[PDB]
Design an enzyme around this catalytic site. Structure first.
Site, PDB file in Angstrom:
ATOM      1  N   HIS A 153       6.823  -9.203  -2.028  1.00 32.40           N
ATOM      2  CA  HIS A 153       6.900  -8.294  -3.161  1.00 32.40           C
ATOM      3  C   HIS A 153       8.271  -8.201  -3.835  1.00 32.40           C
ATOM      4  CE1 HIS A 153       8.600  -4.939  -0.639  1.00 32.40           C
ATOM      5  NE2 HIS A 153       9.163  -4.671  -1.806  1.00 32.40           N
ATOM      6  N   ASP A 161       3.019  -9.367   3.360  1.00 32.14           N
ATOM      7  CA  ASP A 161       4.159  -9.258   2.444  1.00 32.14           C
ATOM      8  C   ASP A 161       5.287 -10.125   3.031  1.00 32.14           C
ATOM      9  OD1 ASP A 161       6.054  -8.408   0.579  1.00 32.14           O
ATOM     10  OD2 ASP A 161       6.114  -6.314   1.339  1.00 32.14           O
ATOM     11  N   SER A 171      13.781  -3.751   1.260  1.00 28.08           N
ATOM     12  CA  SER A 171      12.685  -4.740   1.399  1.00 28.08           C
ATOM     13  C   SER A 171      13.218  -6.156   1.609  1.00 28.08           C
ATOM     14  CB  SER A 171      11.784  -4.760   0.145  1.00 28.08           C
ATOM     15  OG  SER A 171      11.017  -3.552   0.041  1.00 28.08           O
TER      16      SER A 171
END
Ligand SMILES: [Hg+2]
Ligand SMILES: [Hg+2]
EC number: 3.4.21.5
Lengths: 290, 281
Positions: A75, A131, A237
């Site tokens: 992502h 992810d 992330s």
């Protein structure tokens, strides 16, 4: 290299321990004295910065797993709902960094991306299942005291290290706190931040959110009645959730900062991409390409 | 990464929230004002000039103040959302045929605020920014290389930096079409762009330190190119000038620059290795 993974030049290789390392061992208390969140120099030499070239922007974290491969969250490269879809030429990776506010010429290495590989079954419209993404560097980067690869776990390391209560470490330059409106902006550190957190039992992870979690994820964080706090946040992330193995003294990347609701909210936990669960894909990619 | 607890870092008075709530229509404007103040405060913190180790504590201090007032507002939103939820539940028991959906926490927005709160929040951020500005002034008196340049001094320093970068750009153009060295050239360009900042708002060369370190960084980046390709750095590199060498606008000029640069690399010796900014090996 591969054989030398997980052993830090400035620590294990010098028989030096970092300041919170012991907090990950089964024997521990934590009282009065609480150590700082600033990372020690060279304490996460596999740390990688995913950087947007223009306009300049620190997008996400990532990790170095070989002299030619970098691991991150999918992502960070592809997320339609935010109209995000970066291609190789849109960015670069900065390796071996400590402070993000300046170029660190003696330790920093900037690598041009040769190819990005997003998991074909990355489920962005629903729950960020799988992810994960790989980025092959155009040239292999040289290792040094500040740039060293982390190890990826195998079936048993994952089965033995990923137990409720066991703590891992998350690092990154992302936001320091959830803010009252998304607009308030980013409260960012100048130096790599560290936080150690416990893996929580799947039933609690599942009950903590209405998003459908899968076996390709795991969550970590303290529970309401645990007192300690901490979590990953926006900008983190792609960063690694690492664990030191008591069996061989090496650091293993068990996870990838993936998602969460808010940051450090009570009864809420950060979710991470389960690295071992996605290792056959990682291996197929590295073995087929470069 | 979240590690700290900023819940007791706010200067807002405990009783301020129980005063007179302001009309919803006027509320919206006060919340946007607050949002703007936070943005401005965080922006001063991020200013490139202050990305030096000597401002670390002044910054941590200001950050702690900004996050503290942010946390005040965030906790107020949380308390109010909980009350909103119970109200929504009651609304539903009274209009059972209604189809309106309960807002999520992220869609919800603060509904209660008093002028005391707004004024105290506002004053607190203002005071925090003021203290930051004082800490900065003190810092810069005890470190002359951090003192802002006058405009003329900044212009002169910025031109030296831009000129060095343009020589870097010449090297980049001289090898970007060379199969053997393309990657090194491309990274050179990417690294020169990274330290300079966005073309439309580049990092200002505002003090002696930034001029000195930016020059060394640029020199080192150019030297990285030669170290990695195995080529020798020429003593003379014509600075790139769009008006004279643009690839599309002035092809001839471009080709002449590439040629002149490739030739100077060929004629260079390796003396330069004994004088690099960085240690290699
Ligand atoms: Hg959310
Ligand atoms: Hg959100």
């Amino acid at each position: 290299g591969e054989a030398d993974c997980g052993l830090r030049p400035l620590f294990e290789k010098k028989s030096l321990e970092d300041k919170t390392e012991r907090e990950l061992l089964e024997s521990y208390i934590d009282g009065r004295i609480v150590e700082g969140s600033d990372a020690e120099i060279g304490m996460s030499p596999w740390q990688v910065m995913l950087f947007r070239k223009s306009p300049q922007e620190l997008l996400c974290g990532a990790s170095l797993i070989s002299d030619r491969w970098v691991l991150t969250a999918a992502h960070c490269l592809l997320y339609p709902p935010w109209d995000k879809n970066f291609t190789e030429n849109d960015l670069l990776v900065r390796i071996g960094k400590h402070s993000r506010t300046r170029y660190e010429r003696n330790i920093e290495k900037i690598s041009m991306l040769e190819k990005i590989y997003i998991h074909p079954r990355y489920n962005w419209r629903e729950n960020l299942d799988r992810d994960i993404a790989l980025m092959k560097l155009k040239k292999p980067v040289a290792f040094s005291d500040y740039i060293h690869p982390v190890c990826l776990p195998d079936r048993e390391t994952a089965a033995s290290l990923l137990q409720a209560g066991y703590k891992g470490r998350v690092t990154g330059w992302g936001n320091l706190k959830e803010t009252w409106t998304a607009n308030v902006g980013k409260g960012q550190p100048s130096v790599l931040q560290v936080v150690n957190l416990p893996i929580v039992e799947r039933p609690v992870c599942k009950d903590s959110t209405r998003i459908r979690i899968t076996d390709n994820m795991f969550c970590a964080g303290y529970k309401p009645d645990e007192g300690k706090r901490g979590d990953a946040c926006e900008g983190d992330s792609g960063g690694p959730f690492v664990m030191k193995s008591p069996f061989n003294n090496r650091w293993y990347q068990m996870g990838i900062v993936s998602w969460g609701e808010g940051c450090d909210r009570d009864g809420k936990y950060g979710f991470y991409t389960h690295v071992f669960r996605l290792k056959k894909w990682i291996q197929k990619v590295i073995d087929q390409f470069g | 990464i979240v590690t700290k607890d900023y819940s007791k870092e706010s200067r807002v008075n405990e009783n301020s929230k129980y005063g007179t709530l302001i009309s919803d229509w006027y509320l919206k404007g006060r919340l946007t004002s607050l949002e703007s103040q936070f943005i401005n405060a965080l922006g001063i913190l991020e200013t490139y000039h202050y990305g030096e180790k000597e401002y670390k504590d002044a910054k941590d201090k200001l950050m702690t103040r900004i996050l503290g007032e942010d946390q005040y507002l965030l906790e107020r939103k949380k308390v109010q959302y909980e009350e909103y939820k119970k109200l929504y539940k009651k609304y539903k028991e009274e209009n059972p045929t209604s189809k309106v959906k309960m807002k999520t926490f992220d869609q919800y927005t603060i509904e209660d605020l008093t002028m005391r709160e707004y004024n105290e929040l506002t004053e607190s951020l203002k005071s925090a920014v003021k203290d930051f500005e004082k800490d900065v002034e003190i810092i810069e008196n005890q470190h002359h290389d951090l003192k802002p340049f006058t405009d003329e001094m900044e212009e002169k320093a910025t031109a030296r930096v831009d000129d060095l970068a343009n020589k870097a750009y010449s090297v980049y153009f001289a090898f970007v079409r060379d199969t053997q060295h393309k990657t090194e050239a491309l990274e050179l360009k990417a690294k020169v762009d990274l330290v300079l900042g966005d073309e439309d708002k580049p990092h200002r060369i505002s003090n002696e330190r930034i001029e000195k370190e930016m020059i060394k960084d640029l020199e080192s980046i150019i030297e990285d190119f030669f170290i990695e390709t195995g080529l020798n750095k020429p003593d003379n590199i014509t600075s790139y000038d769009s008006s004279k060498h643009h690839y599309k606008n002035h092809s001839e000029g471009f080709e002449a620059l590439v040629k002149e640069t490739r030739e100077a690399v060929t004629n260079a010796n390796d003396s330069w290795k004994t004088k690099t900014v960085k240690k290699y090996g």
